[PDB]
């Protein structure tokens, strides 16, 4: 049963559009069941299901269900992989959200082979241990790694100034005088960045930017953290 949780840690975050709200979600489906993690950037919800739960719930939701749990799970996997990987891909699904106190019920309304399909995700508040493993620790790791990049680019910029100063030191004149770069000084670059650029650049919004520019680094950090 631990396999589902293991595969979940490696999954990136996808972006989903719901009734009025958008959610961030990662999911891992096998023949054994599934593990799902959802967040609205205020709270985090979790659900892990096995084959017994699948059969019971599918029978109750789709009254004329004559299918093994494995096939139902495979249909959910096939329905959700295109829809998540690109939030603009037209998968035959429609989502609704119900918040019952601390629980989140994610409802799916779809059509497979001209037949309607129903599934409800029963999510409880994610344990703090998973919030740490899936968000905090990786997010903190990403920030440290990005800060090393900034540092390596700044050294690279200082190296190019030593090169430009070698041209200025010698008998080297610029032709197009609109090309002159101001020598790079990190302290002033940060100061202008923090006043001029930070306001929009740190806006998390609906999590779309996070899913669009960082999932590659997210997957690299999680794999690193897990050896």
């Amino acid at each position: 049963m631990e396999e589902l949780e293991q595969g979940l840690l490696m999954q990136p975050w996808a972006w989903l559009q719901l009734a009025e709200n958008s959610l961030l979600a990662k999911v891992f489906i096998t023949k054994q069941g599934y593990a799902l993690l959802v967040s609205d950037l205020q709270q985090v919800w979790h659900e892990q299901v096995d084959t017994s739960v699948v059969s019971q719930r599918a029978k109750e939701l789709n009254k004329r269900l004559t299918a093994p749990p494995a096939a139902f799970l495979c249909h959910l996997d096939n329905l959700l992989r295109p829809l998540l990987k690109d939030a603009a891909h037209p998968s035959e699904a429609t989502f609704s959200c119900d918040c019952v106190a601390d629980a989140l019920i994610l409802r799916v309304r779809s059509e497979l082979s001209g037949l309607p399909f129903y599934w409800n995700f029963h999510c409880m508040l994610a344990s703090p241990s998973l919030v740490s493993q899936h968000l905090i620790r990786p997010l903190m790791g990403m920030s440290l790694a990005l800060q090393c990049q900034v540092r390596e680019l700044a050294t690279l910029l200082h190296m190019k100034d030593l090169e430009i100063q070698d041209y200025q030191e010698s008998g080297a004149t610029l032709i197009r005088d609109r090309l002159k770069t101001e020598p790079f000084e990190e302290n002033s670059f940060l100061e202008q960045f923090m006043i001029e650029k930070l306001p929009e650049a740190c806006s998390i919004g609906d999590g779309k930017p996070f899913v669009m520019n960082l999932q590659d680094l997210y997957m690299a950090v999680t794999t690193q953290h897990h050896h």
Binding site: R64, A67, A71, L112, G114, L115, Y118
Partner: protein
Amino acid sequence: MERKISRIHLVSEPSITHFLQVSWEKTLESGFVITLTDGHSAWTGTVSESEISQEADDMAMEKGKYVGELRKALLSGAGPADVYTFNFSKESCYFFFEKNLKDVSFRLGSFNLEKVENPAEVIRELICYCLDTIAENQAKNEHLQKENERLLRDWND
């Protein structure tokens, strides 16, 4: 008042061919009569407009969308991608059919049919209808065949 007679195969008798006759009045949606026969016995059932709409709810399908599925399954206007299965128990007279997808199938409908008292009468009426249909079609095919000949000539000269 329309009708369709289709040839079907039951799961409990893949050997023998059965016939399904569905009749209605200006949409299946308003209700219909279904008859099943093996050329010896006959089983009939009625489906009210109310039952149809009820079935469309129990299945979680839009009423019109549901009637569309019935047309493909019962009036043999099913696509190659639409595979239908039919089951019947001569002991319970219960008739039901399912749609078959990739290794999974789903109950599409069910009827409690009643064994007919006068099968011969029913079979005779069905055959009568077929002959009238064959007749009407042949006549039209002839009228269109002559019009085709007239136009062929009229075009030339």
